[PDB]
Amino acid sequence: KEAIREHQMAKTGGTQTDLFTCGKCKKKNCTYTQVQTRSADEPMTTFVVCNECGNRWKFC
Amino acid sequence: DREVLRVIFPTGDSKVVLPCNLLRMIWNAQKIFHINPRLPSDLHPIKVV
Amino acid sequence: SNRPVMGIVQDTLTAVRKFTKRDVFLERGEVMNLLMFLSTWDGKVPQPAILKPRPLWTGKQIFSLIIPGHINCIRTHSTHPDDEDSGPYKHISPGDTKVVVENGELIMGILCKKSLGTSAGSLVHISYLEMGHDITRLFYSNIQ
Amino acid sequence: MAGILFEDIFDVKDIDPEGKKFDRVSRLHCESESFKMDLILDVNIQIYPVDLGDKFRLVIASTLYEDGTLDDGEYNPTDDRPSRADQFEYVMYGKVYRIEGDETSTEAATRLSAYVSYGGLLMRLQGDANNLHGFEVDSRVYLLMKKLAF
Ligand SMILES: [Zn+2]
Numbered sequence: 001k002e003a004i005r006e007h008q009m010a011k012t013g014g015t016q017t018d019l020f021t022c023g024k025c026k027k028k029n030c031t032y033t034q035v036q037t038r039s040a041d042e043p044m045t046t047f048v049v050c051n052e053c054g055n056r057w058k059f060c
Numbered sequence: 061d062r063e064v065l066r067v068i069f070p071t072g073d074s075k076v077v078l079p080c081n082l083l084r085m086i087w088n089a090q091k092i093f094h095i096n097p098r099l100p101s102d103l104h105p106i107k108v109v
Numbered sequence: 110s111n112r113p114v115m116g117i118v119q120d121t122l123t124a125v126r127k128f129t130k131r132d133v134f135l136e137r138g139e140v141m142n143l144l145m146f147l148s149t150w151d152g153k154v155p156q157p158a159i160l161k162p163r164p165l166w167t168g169k170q171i172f173s174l175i176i177p178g179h180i181n182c183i184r185t186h187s188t189h190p191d192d193e194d195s196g197p198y199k200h201i202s203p204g205d206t207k208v209v210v211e212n213g214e215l216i217m218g219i220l221c222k223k224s225l226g227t228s229a230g231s232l233v234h235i236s237y238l239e240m241g242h243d244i245t246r247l248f249y250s251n252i253q
Numbered sequence: 254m255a256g257i258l259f260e261d262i263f264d265v266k267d268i269d270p271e272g273k274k275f276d277r278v279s280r281l282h283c284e285s286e287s288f289k290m291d292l293i294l295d296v297n298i299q300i301y302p303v304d305l306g307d308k309f310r311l312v313i314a315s316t317l318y319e320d321g322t323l324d325d326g327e328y329n330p331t332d333d334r335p336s337r338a339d340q341f342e343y344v345m346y347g348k349v350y351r352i353e354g355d356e357t358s359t360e361a362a363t364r365l366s367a368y369v370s371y372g373g374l375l376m377r378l379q380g381d382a383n384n385l386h387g388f389e390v391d392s393r394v395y396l397l398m399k400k401l402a403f
Contacts (some may be wrong), residue, residue, distance in 0.1 A: 014178065020193050021193055021194065023226040038116065042222075043222055058187075060190075060223045077111055084235065087181075088181075091179075091181065096388065097354075097356075098352070102156060117388045131278045131295070131373070132275060132299075146378065154328075155326055156325075157346065159372065160345065160370070160395075161341075161343050162301065162342070162343065163300065164328075166372075169372065173268065198363040204361045209350075214392075216373065217370075217375065218375055
């Protein structure tokens with residue numbers, strides 16, 4: 001009953017960084033994006049998303 | 061409206077793209093009219109209504 | 110995507126960052142030199158930013174000259190500097206890093222692109238709204 | 254006739270703005286000799302080499318020619334009017350950008366704070382009633398200081 005209970009415990013992945021604060025919940029429960037390798041005229045940005053309470057903002 | 065609005069946005073995000081930024085417009089009136097927190101705020105509320 | 114398409118870039122964007130530096134100081138001679146570069150100007154020389162020990166002008170003063178004189182764009186410094194908030198609020202020692210302009214006059218804040226364009230909260234979008242394309246195009250050509 | 258906006262002699266609390274500082278500009282922290290009012294200000298150290306704990310004289314005037322209007326410019330280098338104290342070691346032209354206070358407590362407004370900008374140069378003045386006659390305005394104030402390294 002333990003082992004079959006364990007089989008949900010983490011799905012298959014992760015990430016979380018816990019660096020950027022979220023102004024909607026003070027907790028730094030945030031995720032970060034590495035994208036825009038080249039793109040156009042828009043500068044490559046680091047995008048940060050807060051898992052809880054759904055917040056997303058940019059390095060810029 | 062506040063009670064209705066909870067139905068419209070179950071995501072609870074109040075940040076939406078909308079026309080006419082009244083805040084900037086209202087602010088500009090303050091920049092123009094020179095209203096400040098150390099000046100009285102003479103107003104007729106019904107006129108507002 | 111209800112956003113501006115214009116964007117000042119590269120050399121121009123870098124020198125603007127350089128230009129917003131606190132250590133930027135100008136001479137009267139160069140102010141006249143800078144004034145002639147203007148695509149448009151009131152014809153009325155501005156007051157020195159400094160009088161003693163010697164008369165001087167600041168780059169923020171002069172950038173604000175470029176700016177049209179009855180419109181403002183607020184806060185989005187959008188630069189790494191300071192502290193993902195909380196810190197800059199410590200205590201409203203609120204200048205330099207964060208961007209703020211009043212009556213066409215830049216108070217503080219190193220510039221970014223999110224300020225400069227192709228994004229929400231950009232100066233470019235509001236100038237387009239207030240000043241219109243024609244005034245904004247002449248300002249833009251002038252600044253460049 | 255020379256309706257000075259402010260005058261006081263100030264003492265340097267700090268010349269090191271949070272350590273990191275900057276090259277041509279540095280932010281001083283000062284306190285008035287009443288020791289009831291304090292001040293922080295950005296300065297050009299290169300033209301005015303401050304020392305820590307120094308005793309400074311500070312004056313503020315929104316005008317130069319006796320009290321009459323002048324909030325204009327072509328600042329006219331050729332003025333010959335002795336109207337200016339100019340005799341002070343250091344002068345700046347600027348605006349007040351922010352005012353702090355607290356009137357929600359009932360009349361309170363008890364420990365009024367003023368923030369000022371001279372060409373971008375930030376300033377903070379704190380005081381119960383020293384700023385009771387001033388408020389945030391467009392560029393008009395002239396700030397004059399002397400008594401360097403007294
Ligand atoms: Zn959050």
